[PDB]
């Protein structure tokens, strides 16, 4: 109870120093390695060096059992505050990965940070998830007179002047691949597959829409990533499926143009858009069978 | 007279023989014979015979020149019974004459009357009246003989003795003889007259007019009236009848003696205290005092006019007697000041005109009397008349008296509204102040108490807030705002209005704020709003205000209220689970709080943060049931 006596009180000396990191350091940016962090990040190195420093006054053995409790808790405490002092959470996220680069002992700190990001991605996903089905829902209720507004004032401006420019600030091209993949695969196309039917007229409406989607999901820096081009090619192929009479459709399959379509998906796309005939039949068994022979 | 004629005459006299007795009387040649005959007639004539039958003695004597011997001769001729009486031996005749003359003289001496030769008829009528009255007890038994007399002495005796005695005897059913009444002292005679079966003004008036006034006028002295009747022992002034008899006797124009006015005053001055135990006492005293005339010597150095002036204020002084009024002159200056202040306060009650004030001026330190007058108008809420009087007279009320009456009205007021009669009177009272700036705080107090009356406010549970209670909150004006937030749900979101009320309370109560901007008071006020909003389920507005509180320089003093937002749980949330959005907000405020809270609280604040972060990590943010 002597050892407990000092451990909570030096917890106080670092916390006073954290409140003491001068306020103007959370708003100014310093150049450091190339990434740019805020002026406080480098001062920040001292606090967690200083926690190891404060341990010398009775070390481990006398401290081993709560250190992880006490270490993780301190990492958690610092993390929460700087979100309210560092306005731009993306500016915020970059600082935090840089700190746990400098000293790879800040385990909880990365968990907090990676989850902080997961959140911000989901925020971007949720807002975008809402618009697309809704425009698609909008298309759904008035085939004849769609309100193209859903796309026009909020979704694309979001992407071009809001969603996407935000994502540039975070700089990690593996992740953007995860986001673009999300919209194309899990959002847009899947809802489209699950309508009861995609009216003959709805498809062209839908055709005007998605293409508008391609226009806002083009990230030139990524022409170099494989699935980025495969998503954009595929979507390019999806609009084309949507506005053709049956004969052009078999022609594509054979051309490998169904490279990005499962036979399951190829037939399902056949099943949703056009009425039952042998014509749909000869073509469907042909694709599953040529797919069978290969 | 001839001895034989004297004996014969006595027989005719005792028989009531008017003819023979008148003929003998007209035959008498000398005044000595007439005197001897009138003595015999006075005693020996039958007392019950008509007084008119002896009226022949009042007629002038016709000297018919009949000799006594010729008359004696005719009488003995006509009545043979006289022979045995008149024709005896000389010694028998002398014995008869001497026995009869002794009886006649002894009878007259028994009445203390001597018939004088110079006044023979007057003394005969008086003697005969006493002889007859000794038998009949009628004091007017000789009225027919007296009415035929031209003697002023007999008329004065009739008016002064006989008529008073006849009225007294008829009134009391007494049979007092003239001789007994004339031998009473003047005091005893007046004492017999003052025996009244009932003491009423009508009875006393009849006795005065028909007994006492004629008797005292005949005696030539009114001294028996003041000694026996008109004294303090007979006039205790303890009944309306005794007082009205005193007023009636005090107005009699006889007697013009200084002793009357002294005795009248001694009755009023000794017994006038009993008058306090009449339709209008002041008017009765005024009428009595006016009846003395303007003789200042009677009044112990106060003029008639000064008494009449002083009488007008007796009701205002609660003084009911002249002796207590004179005693006020001997009282000290403090007692005199108190009485004069009561006079002015009583005279100025109700609706008054300028003449009411002029009457007090005619009666008239004047400054102290005027102060008591103004205090009485203030006391009675006569503000319209007070404002009119102050504007016309130029008299100023002392600011101390104004402030005393302000607090009197303010402390009685039932509520703070300027519609309340006592709040109106308190406000009117402050408008009399010559310098409003020196007492600005009293107007600030009226203003804030009116503002507070528009809200639901209670001093204690079940006790209404009165204006007077505002002074109890001087040590903590925030407690009024705390009670306002609890009782008025519309104020919970209106921080500007409650901050304005708090600034007005500090101004009115002369409480010094922490700084010019009320920085600490506003932080505390914001803390009380957040606490009240959380207690009422309004997490949104509590959160918005806790973001304003956390950015304040003194936010560390209020860390508990900020922490309460970070741990808030609404029992009406779905499944009693914190909505996911609210978890982000609570994390939101708890780690801003980690930068400002006391270092000793870091563990508790971090534990709430980690509990919310763990809960958030369990949620499927894609299919969030608690969104």
């Amino acid at each position: 109870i002597y050892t407990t006596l000092k451990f909570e009180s030096m917890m106080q000396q670092r916390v006073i120093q954290i409140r003491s990191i001068p306020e103007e350091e959370y708003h100014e940016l310093v150049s450091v390695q190339p990434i740019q962090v805020s002026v406080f990040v480098q001062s920040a190195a001292k606090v967690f060096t200083e926690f190891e420093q404060g341990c010398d006054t009775i070390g481990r053995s006398k401290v081993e059992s709560i250190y992880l409790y006490k270490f993780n808790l301190l990492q958690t405490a610092f993390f929460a505050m700087v979100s309210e002092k560092v306005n731009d959470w993306t500016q915020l996220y970059k600082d935090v990965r840089y700190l746990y680069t400098e000293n790879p002992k800040l385990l909880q700190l990365m968990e907090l940070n990676s989850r902080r990001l997961d959140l911000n991605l989901n925020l971007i996903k949720k807002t975008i998830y809402k618009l697309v089905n809704d425009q698609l829902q909008e298309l759904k209720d008035n085939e004849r007179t769609p309100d193209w507004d859903i796309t026009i004032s909020s979704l694309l401006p979001y992407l071009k002047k809001t969603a996407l420019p935000t994502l540039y600030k975070l700089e990690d091209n593996t992740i953007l691949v995860a986001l673009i993949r999300y919209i194309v695969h899990d959002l847009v196309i899947d809802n489209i597959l699950h309508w009861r039917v995609i009216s003959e007229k709805s498809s062209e409406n839908l055709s005007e829409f998605i293409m508008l989607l391609l226009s806002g999901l083009e990230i030139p820096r990524l022409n170099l990533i494989e699935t980025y081009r495969h998503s954009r090619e595929k979507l390019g192929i999806l609009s084309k499926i949507l506005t053709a009479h049956l004969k052009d459709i078999l022609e594509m399959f054979y051309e490998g143009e169904f490279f990005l379509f499962e036979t399951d998906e190829i037939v399902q796309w056949i099943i949703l858009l056009f009425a039952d005939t042998p014509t749909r039949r000869d073509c469907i068994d042909e694709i599953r069978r040529v797919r069978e022979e290969a | 007279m001839n001895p034989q004629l004297y004996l014969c005459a006595s027989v005719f006299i005792t028989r009531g023989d008017v003819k023979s007795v008148s003929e003998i009387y007209q035959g008498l040649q000398s005044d000595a014979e007439r005197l001897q005959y009138l003595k015999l007639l006075c005693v020996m004539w039958p007392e019950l015979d008509a007084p008119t039958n002896i009226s022949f003695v009042l007629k002038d004597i016709e000297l018919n020149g009949m000799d006594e011997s010729s008359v004696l001769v005719s009488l003995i001729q006509e009545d043979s019974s006289l022979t045995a009486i008149s024709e005896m031996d000389v010694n028998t005749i002398s014995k008869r004459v001497n026995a009869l003359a002794s009886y006649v003289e002894e009878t007259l001496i028994g009445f203390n009357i001597h018939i004088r030769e110079t006044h023979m008829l007057e003394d005969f009528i008086r003697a005969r009246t006493l002889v007859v009255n000794s038998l009949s007890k009628d004091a007017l038994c000789s009225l027919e003989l007296l009415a035929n007399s031209t003697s002023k002495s007999l008329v004065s005796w009739l008016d002064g003795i006989l008529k008073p005695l006849d009225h007294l005897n008829r009134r009391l059913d007494t049979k007092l003889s003239i001789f007994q009444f004339e031998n009473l002292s003047a005091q005893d005679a007046v004492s017999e007259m003052w025996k009244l079966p009932v003491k009423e003004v009508s009875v006393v008036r009849s006795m005065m007019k028909y007994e006492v006034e004629p008797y005292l006028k005949f005696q030539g002295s009114y001294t028996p009236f003041y000694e026996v009747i008109f004294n303090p022992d007979n006039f205790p002034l303890d009944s309306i009848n005794n007082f009205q008899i005193y007023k009636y006797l005090s107005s009699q124009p006889t007697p013009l003696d200084t002793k009357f006015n002294e005795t009248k005053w001694n009755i009023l001055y000794s017994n006038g205290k009993n008058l306090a135990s009449l339709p209008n006492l002041v008017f009765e005293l005024e009428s009595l005092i006016k009846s003395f005339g303007d003789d200042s010597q009677i009044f112990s150095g106060i003029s008639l006019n000064e008494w009449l002036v002083n009488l007008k204020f007796m009701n205002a002084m609660d003084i009911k007697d002249l002796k207590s009024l004179k005693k006020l002159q001997n009282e000290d200056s403090v007692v005199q000041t108190s009485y004069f202040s009561i006079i002015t306060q009583n005279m100025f009650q109700g609706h008054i005109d300028i003449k009411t004030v002029q009457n007090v001026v005619e009666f008239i330190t004047n400054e102290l009397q005027t102060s008591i007058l103004l205090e009485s108008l203030l006391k009675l809420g006569k503000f319209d008349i007070l404002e009119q009087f102050v504007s016309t007279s130029g008299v100023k009320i002392q600011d101390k008296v104004i402030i005393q009456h302000f607090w009197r009205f303010f402390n009685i007021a039932s509520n703070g509204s300027l519609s309340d009669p006592d709040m109106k009177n308190a406000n009117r009272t402050l408008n009399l102040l010559s310098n409003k700036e020196t007492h600005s705080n009293l107007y600030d107090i009226l203003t804030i108490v009116d503002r507070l009356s528009h809200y639901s406010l209670s001093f204690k549970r079940g006790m209404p807030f009165k204006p007077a209670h505002i002074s109890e909150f001087k040590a903590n004006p925030m407690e009024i705002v705390e009670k306002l937030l609890d009782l008025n749900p519309k104020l919970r979101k209106n921080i500007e209005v409650t901050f304005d009320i708090l600034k007005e309370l500090y101004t009115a109560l002369q409480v010094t704020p922490s700084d010019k901007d009320f920085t600490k008071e506003y932080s505390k006020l914001l803390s009380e709003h957040i606490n009240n909003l959380l207690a009422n389920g309004d997490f949104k507005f509590a959160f918005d205000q806790a973001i304003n509180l956390i950015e304040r320089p003194d936010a560390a003093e209020h860390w508990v209220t900020i922490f309460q937002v970070g741990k808030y749980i609404d029992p009406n949330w779905l499944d009693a689970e914190i909505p996911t959005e609210i978890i982000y907000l609570q994390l939101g405020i708890v780690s801003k709080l980690l930068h400002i809270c006391p270092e000793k609280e870091y563990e508790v604040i971090t534990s709430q943060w980690s509990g919310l972060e763990l809960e958030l990590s369990t949620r499927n943010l894609i299919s969030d049931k608690y969104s």
Partner: protein, 91 residues
């Protein structure tokens, strides 16, 4: 009754003070007084025929009238006898 008693008292007093001449005068004076009271009682009964004044008179004065009449007659007779005896002595 008071008047009858006062007349009776005065009469017997005056008779007791002391020649038949004195008692003759006292009885004659009382006879004249009683005659005046009689005349008054008769007048009252004439002015009001319902008055008992005559009966009151007879009740109160009859014995006194009888006594006075007897004494007056006795003394008048003694006066005459003394005179007749004197006249015979002179003859």
């Amino acid at each position: 009754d008071t008047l009858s008693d006062q007349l009776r008292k005065n009469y017997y007093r005056d008779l007791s003070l002391f020649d038949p001449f004195y008692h003759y005068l006292i009885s004659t004076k009382l006879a004249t007084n009683l005659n005046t009271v009689r005349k008054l009682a008769i007048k009252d009964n004439l002015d009001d025929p319902s008055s008992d004044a005559i009966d009151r008179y007879q009740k109160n004065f009859s014995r006194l009238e009888e006594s006075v009449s007897s004494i007056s007659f006795s003394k008048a007779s003694k006066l005459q006898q003394k005179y007749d005896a004197y006249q015979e002595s002179q003859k």
